[PDB]
Amino acid sequence: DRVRSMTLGNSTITTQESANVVVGYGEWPSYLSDREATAEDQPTQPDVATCRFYTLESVQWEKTSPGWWWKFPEALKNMGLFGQNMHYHYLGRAGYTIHVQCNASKFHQGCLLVVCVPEAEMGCADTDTTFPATELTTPHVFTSDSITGKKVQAAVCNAGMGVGVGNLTIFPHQWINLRTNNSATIVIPYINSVPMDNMFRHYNFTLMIIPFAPLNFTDGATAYVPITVTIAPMYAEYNGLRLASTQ
Amino acid sequence: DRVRSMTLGNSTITTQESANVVVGYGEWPSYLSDREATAEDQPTQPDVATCRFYTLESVQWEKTSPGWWWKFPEALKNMGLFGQNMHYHYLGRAGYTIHVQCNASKFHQGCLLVVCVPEAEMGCADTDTTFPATELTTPHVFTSDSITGKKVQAAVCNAGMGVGVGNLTIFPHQWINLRTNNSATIVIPYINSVPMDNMFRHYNFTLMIIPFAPLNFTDGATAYVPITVTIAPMYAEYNGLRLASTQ
Amino acid sequence: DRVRSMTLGNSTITTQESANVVVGYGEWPSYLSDREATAEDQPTQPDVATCRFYTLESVQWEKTSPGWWWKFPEALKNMGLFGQNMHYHYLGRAGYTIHVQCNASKFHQGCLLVVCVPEAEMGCADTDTTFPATELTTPHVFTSDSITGKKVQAAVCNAGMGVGVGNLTIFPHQWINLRTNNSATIVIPYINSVPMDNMFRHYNFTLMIIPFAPLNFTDGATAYVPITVTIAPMYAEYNGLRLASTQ
Amino acid sequence: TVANTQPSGPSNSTEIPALTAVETGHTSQVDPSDTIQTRHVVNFHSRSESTIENFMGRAACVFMDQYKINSTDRFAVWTINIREMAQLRRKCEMFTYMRFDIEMTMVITSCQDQDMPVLTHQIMYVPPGGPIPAKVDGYEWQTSTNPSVFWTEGNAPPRISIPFISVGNAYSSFYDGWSHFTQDGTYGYTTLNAMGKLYIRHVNRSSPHQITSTIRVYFKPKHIKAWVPRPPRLCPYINKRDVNFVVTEITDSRTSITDTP
Amino acid sequence: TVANTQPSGPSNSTEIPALTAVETGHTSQVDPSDTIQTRHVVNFHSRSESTIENFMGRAACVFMDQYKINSTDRFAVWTINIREMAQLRRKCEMFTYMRFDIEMTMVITSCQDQDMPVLTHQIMYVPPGGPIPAKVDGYEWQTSTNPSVFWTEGNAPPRISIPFISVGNAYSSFYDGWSHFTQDGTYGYTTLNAMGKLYIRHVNRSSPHQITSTIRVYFKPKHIKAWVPRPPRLCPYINKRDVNFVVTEITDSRTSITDTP
Amino acid sequence: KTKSMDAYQIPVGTGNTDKTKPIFSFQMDPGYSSVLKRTLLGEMLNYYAHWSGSVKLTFLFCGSAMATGKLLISYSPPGASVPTSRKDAMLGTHIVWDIGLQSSCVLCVPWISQSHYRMVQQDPYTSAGYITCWYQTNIVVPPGAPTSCDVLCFASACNDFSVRLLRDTPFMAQPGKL
Amino acid sequence: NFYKDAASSASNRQDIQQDPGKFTDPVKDLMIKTLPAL
Amino acid sequence: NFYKDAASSASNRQDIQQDPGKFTDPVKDLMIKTLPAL
Ligand SMILES: CCCCCCCCCCCCCCCC(=O)O
Ligand SMILES: CCCCCCCCCCCCCCCC(=O)O
Ligand SMILES: Nc1nc2[nH]cnc2c(=O)[nH]1
Ligand SMILES: Nc1nc2[nH]cnc2c(=O)[nH]1
Ligand SMILES: Nc1nc2[nH]cnc2c(=O)[nH]1
């Protein structure tokens, strides 16, 4: 039960050392029902053009790297037809199979926390101002210090949202322990207070990858150990066609 | 039976003086069946995002205007999500409700031929060379003369394909007689020798609008009489996802 | 369903381009029942002498004419036997078929609002005084300005009763659009807080005719376009015989 | 609840739901299911709070006046009408005829301009034609058949219920008519407003210092029936005994017909 | 009640309850019956007081402000939010989405900075977009359709119930998103907080001396449904319109990893 | 033009200039929009804080019987800017309205919202789209008919329309004793 | 009901009735949504 | 219940429900306590 495969919309994912997929809060994503819907317009359901695996830019994991975060759905804009249906539609749902994968040898050690946090409302570096939208969204890095300026407070102990970073285990999450597994798959149903929401101005969840045990290896092992994020929306549907937004 | 309405994917069309819609060759378009298909991949069927009315640029109809032609599907590129699914997919079908509309008073006269010709393979102006692709595709105009150069032979008597222009009545067509109707709706099923075909390098049909009786009116009537083309694909489905083509 | 005829008490009304008659609030008028009555005296019911079409003085509709209003039942005094039964009786009901008719060519344009407003309590031109009864009741004209003096405030935007004139559509009303119809028929049941009321000191409703789109025509068309009001009470009954009142 | 939205598909037929004629006095009954393609959605939305009982059924201030303790400024008089204050007037001048019975709630707050003992107030209602008091020791105040409320301060506000006391089958917000039969005298709804005066005083005989009490009457209509709706008032409320107005713009202006924020 | 402990004995087998893998996102479901030898004990302990209705169902202070009698300091305004005070904020910022309807209780205590007669207070709530008063004789105060509470001192505190008045299917404690569609303007939960202002004043017209009243609003959530739990707040609450923070130690320190008291 | 009758009528002409320019354009939210805050839909909506359902816009053409035309009335949900061309406006929920004997058309704004209700007041979180009108072809008129016509607009609610949270209206604005 | 008088009673807020047919379509000749108006 | 409105009611403190399976073990493949994790 360590080997697993995920095939979505002409893109399959192979893993051979992995924990089983974690279904966020025990709910598998699905289309919006007729009783819980709010928009009387026929939604667009391109199941194979958008609901497929998209591979983000990989990041180098070093001995002193604090962590990273992505903000979805927005991070998936201008990527395939999933980003084109954002610009032409006003509403959207998805279910985001998140496949974070980081391989190593049996002579490397380290432990990542791959956690999906719904509504990770970040905090500004200077407590009396507001920071631009380019700060939130090459994933932004945490820092093992305290930054100052018109930035998101990207310290690691307070994970950006101002909590204990060890208490991020309450969210749907996995661990990549390099002796056990080299990938972590999290399935996230559509979590929001509203049945459909705009995908640009609203970040439904953020993906935080935080090494609790840092990477360590002796001389001779490969120093370049990259972390690759492969996110695939599921059961994505759109509503409210209009002219394309320039963003 | 003169009033009619067409509602496709959040876009309706109202006409009050019209002939009934003409179904091309008596076949209404539909999705590709399982026995006549050729590509074993799940096709994308965005029925409401692409199968809707798109309104092209209107053209001025004058006393001496020879005619116009559009080349579809290609003319519908970079227009809505129907053009975005062209750039990301390799194959495509549609069924193209074509609604050509040209209104006038009861003191204007004239008669247009709105004809859809499958595979209108044009002819070069100089008989020994080949002309660029910008010549084929502001719709190109015919000329009531003989042009010369690296161009499509856009004379009107030979409608570009080298036949008698009065013999274009064999194709699915209507007439806009300004005393009877002010619109012409033609439904075109997917006509090709192949079940799916690429939408960029291949022009499944061209829309020729040719005034047989020219526009005429005395002084005081409105001189600006525009012709508007409102084409809506139907049962469009796509196959072969890939990176976006730059065209 | 455009031709219609109305025959009341030896007087018929012919129209050939008209909307269907509008029944005020969905109630057709009738005689007062035995359970909703208040006066134990045998009422006078002259069904053919009073319940018939009476034609008021026609008014000229110009390019800059603001509008008109009549006040009924009072406007129908000293007109036939319907006005004689007012002077001898103390109480009265009716049901007022209102047939406003304004014909034009197919080269005239304009749009009237024929609205019946129950209890159109007007407003004085100077806000601190009261105006005589000859101001309320050749129909009084609105003005496209602001008048001052001991008069009813006959501006058009505030229709005299101090509301938005576009919001007079809540009342039973029709439109005379000169391209569609040349008449507007409104049936008004007896609307009052009381089963019978005196017809002189109390104006049950007023008939406001307001051109939203003004009259327009080129040179050569007939400039004199009159608006004629043909009001016919229905199910009129009277109570309280006495000597004739001198008004 | 409100009507659900039925699912529709692509249509090409000789039927035309969008095509209407406004000049028929007819409002089109079309839904978004007739114009575009819709999904099936179940509307659990209700129209429970737009009803006339929920709309009008909130206590609105209708009268404020002062009356002092320790002359004619010693007590208050109102000659009941809705037209004293603008916000409830615009709700009642929205229907031509309306039939309701109201309960009134008084908020009586005494303020010093030496210590007040305790203040007890009397709100006496005389129906129309009754004897009016011209003094606090009037003799009218004894209420043999007039309804009256005695209230001492520091308690709950005095709420009593009133029936539908109109002569007609409904109250009339508007009366386009005259008072006399010769079309003379008072014009408008003032003629119909025959509801008695309301007299409020301190039943305390006197006070060592000048105490000024103010009363706030709050009508809340209930068991409400309204007929013949009319548009809401646009221009303000210059008078109380007549619908007189200065002409005002119908709507806020823009710079162009295309201009939009 | 909570689960009883089943009796176990000495075990020597190829099954391993203690051996787990945390990297599966899985919390082990083992009991002390799996690791050691246990006796049978019947647990009559219940989890009745750890539920969300019992945890959140206590009235917490959410607003304090002064308003004086006898300008704009004559009345108070709150523009309702939970974020005014830290203790109830940390309970509500513990769940991402939560759906509840609340009753509010006011504690109004007037204090003198010559004798106050009696003080009657008005707590008027305007839903968002309504007319705001800029003065005590505003004209806004008459509450034709605004809810309002009139309270005279010396009585029980004014408690009224409020429904779930949010536009969305739940209140959102956190909104990781922007106000405008171009990702611009206001960031955070402020965009979603559209609940009307709360206006409190003395309905007493004036006073012979300066009296300063203070109001204390106590929300108590009831009929509570909470979704998506999140960790409690570590660092303090610098702002009210944003979750901004100074970085703080995660836990109190020790001198050594072995060091223990 | 507000304190007059010309506020209601929409100028629609026959010409060669400005046929790639909108005829009108305004906010779709009937509470704060400076066009339809005063309608009967907007007067009864301003007593409430929340509103749900579809509104529909009816367009009466008040030209001559010989003048014919076609118009494109479009609704585009928020998220992008106002449509500046007819190409960008025909991507929203539009209707091409042929002008003939019927002479009236209904654009039903289909209630495409994220939430179940919207705020009557203007806030970014719940803002309605844009209603623009364009020339589909033109207005064509005979030699003797008047060449300048005008469209008259209407607005009402559908059967699934509801208002939700009672409040006071801001319009009355009493200054003092009457 | 703790009082005999009917005016001394609670407001009947619960009932929800409506007849919009007497305002939106008060016309005599029935007008079908599908059919043309004239 | 002395009021018609549902928000004007007592807090339903009595009910005690819980589903800790959606937080402690949200995994797809069932994991037995007895068996090894992988
Ligand atoms: C202490 C006894 C108090 C009794 C007070 C009686 C109040 C009379 C009823 C109120 C009049 C309502 C008139 C409404 C007319 C309208 O709607 O225009
Ligand atoms: C006198 C009338 C008083 C009415 C007061 C209405 C109070 C509005 C409801 C409270 C808002 C609750 C918002 C919670 C949002 C969150 O949990 O973050
Ligand atoms: N493939 C799959 N479909 C589901 N539908 C509901 N739950 C599931 C699941 O766990 N897996
Ligand atoms: N709507 C419609 N569907 C079809 N399916 C096959 N033929 C037809 C047709 O003519 N009209
Ligand atoms: N002629 C006629 N009599 C009625 N009696 C009740 N309704 C009607 C009606 O609509 N027409």
Side-chain angles (χ1 to χ4, degrees), chain C residues 72-96:
Chain C
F72 301 103
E74 177 270 331
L76 287 175
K77 74 178 180 67
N78 71 28
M79 188 183 288
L81 286 171
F82 185 77
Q84 293 296 322
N85 291 117
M86 289 185 182
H87 294 89
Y88 290 94
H89 290 91
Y90 169 62
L91 300 175
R93 289 170 61 95
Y96 299 109

Side-chain angles (χ1 to χ4, degrees), chain A residues 5-13 31 45-54 80-82 97 231-236, chain B residues 40 42-44 88-89 238-242:
Chain A
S5 62
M6 300 156 264
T7 74
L8 267 53
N10 79 20
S11 67
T12 182
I13 295 295
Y31 293 108
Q45 294 175 355
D47 57 352
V48 292
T50 63
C51 301
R52 64 178 296 277
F53 282 96
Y54 296 103
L81 286 171
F82 185 77
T97 298
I231 179 164
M234 295 190 293
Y235 295 96
Chain B
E40 53 267 16
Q42 188 66 253
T44 302
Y88 290 94
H89 290 91
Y238 299 95
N239 216 333
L241 260 176
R242 72 178 189 275

Side-chain angles (χ1 to χ4, degrees), chain C residues 22 25 71 118-124 127 131 146 158 160-162 175 180 193 198 200-203 247, chain D residues 23-24 97 169 172 174-179 181 183 187-189 228 230 233-235 239 243-245 247-248:
Chain C
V22 159
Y25 301 107
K71 283 183 177 283
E119 304 294 329
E121 184 180 355
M122 292 293 174
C124 192
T127 72
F131 56 89
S146 281
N158 290 322
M161 51 191 287
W175 297 86
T180 298
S193 66
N198 203 3
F200 285 103
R201 71 176 181 180
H202 179 64
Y203 310 106
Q247 61 184 355
Chain D
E23 61 269 12
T24 55
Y97 306 107
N169 293 312
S172 297
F174 289 96
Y175 182 75
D176 192 2
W178 292 96
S179 182
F181 296 99
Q183 293 181 357
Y187 178 74
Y189 54 83
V228 185
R230 64 174 58 242
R233 182 70 182 266
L234 176 59
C235 49
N239 297 116
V243 49
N244 292 318
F245 61 92
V247 66
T248 75

Side-chain angles (χ1 to χ4, degrees), chain D residues 15-17 19-21 23-27 29-30 34 46-48 51 53-54 57-58 101 161-163 220 222-224 229, chain G residues 5-18 20-27 29-38:
Chain D
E15 65 185 2
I16 41 79
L19 278 71
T20 322
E23 61 269 12
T24 55
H26 185 277
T27 302
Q29 299 301 108
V30 297
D34 296 328
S46 180
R47 290 180 178 178
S48 67
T51 62
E53 186 71 29
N54 282 312
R58 288 174 185 264
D101 39 11
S161 180
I162 308 158
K220 179 168 72 177
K222 62 185 177 181
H223 301 94
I224 305 162
Chain G
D5 308 320
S8 63
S9 178
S11 67
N12 51 6
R13 287 178 161 160
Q14 192 87 33
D15 51 26
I16 172 178
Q17 291 286 110
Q18 63 179 357
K22 61 176 70 176
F23 302 109
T24 63
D25 49 355
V27 296
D29 212 6
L30 79 167
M31 287 189 51
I32 303 298
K33 185 191 294 185
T34 291
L35 274 300
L38 295 174

Side-chain angles (χ1 to χ4, degrees), chain E residues 177-197:
Chain E
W178 292 96
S179 182
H180 295 171
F181 296 99
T182 179
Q183 293 181 357
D184 196 75
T186 302
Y187 178 74
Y189 54 83
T190 301
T191 70
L192 295 179
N193 202 357
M195 294 79 176
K197 275 71 68 177

Side-chain angles (χ1 to χ4, degrees), chain A residues 69 71 118-124 129 131-137 151-153 160-161 200-204 206 208, chain E residues 173-180 183-193 240-241 243-244:
Chain A
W69 74 87
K71 283 183 177 283
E119 304 294 329
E121 184 180 355
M122 292 293 174
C124 192
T129 61
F131 56 89
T134 60
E135 305 300 346
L136 286 167
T137 315
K151 294 176 70 68
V152 51
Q153 183 68 43
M161 51 191 287
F200 285 103
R201 71 176 181 180
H202 179 64
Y203 310 106
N204 292 112
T206 80
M208 295 178 182
Chain E
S173 297
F174 289 96
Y175 182 75
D176 192 2
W178 292 96
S179 182
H180 295 171
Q183 293 181 357
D184 196 75
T186 302
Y187 178 74
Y189 54 83
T190 301
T191 70
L192 295 179
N193 202 357
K240 300 193 271 78
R241 278 83 57 85
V243 49
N244 292 318

Side-chain angles (χ1 to χ4, degrees), chain A residues 23 28-29 235, chain H residues 28:
Chain A
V23 178
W28 197 268
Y235 295 96
Chain H
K28 182 181 186 295

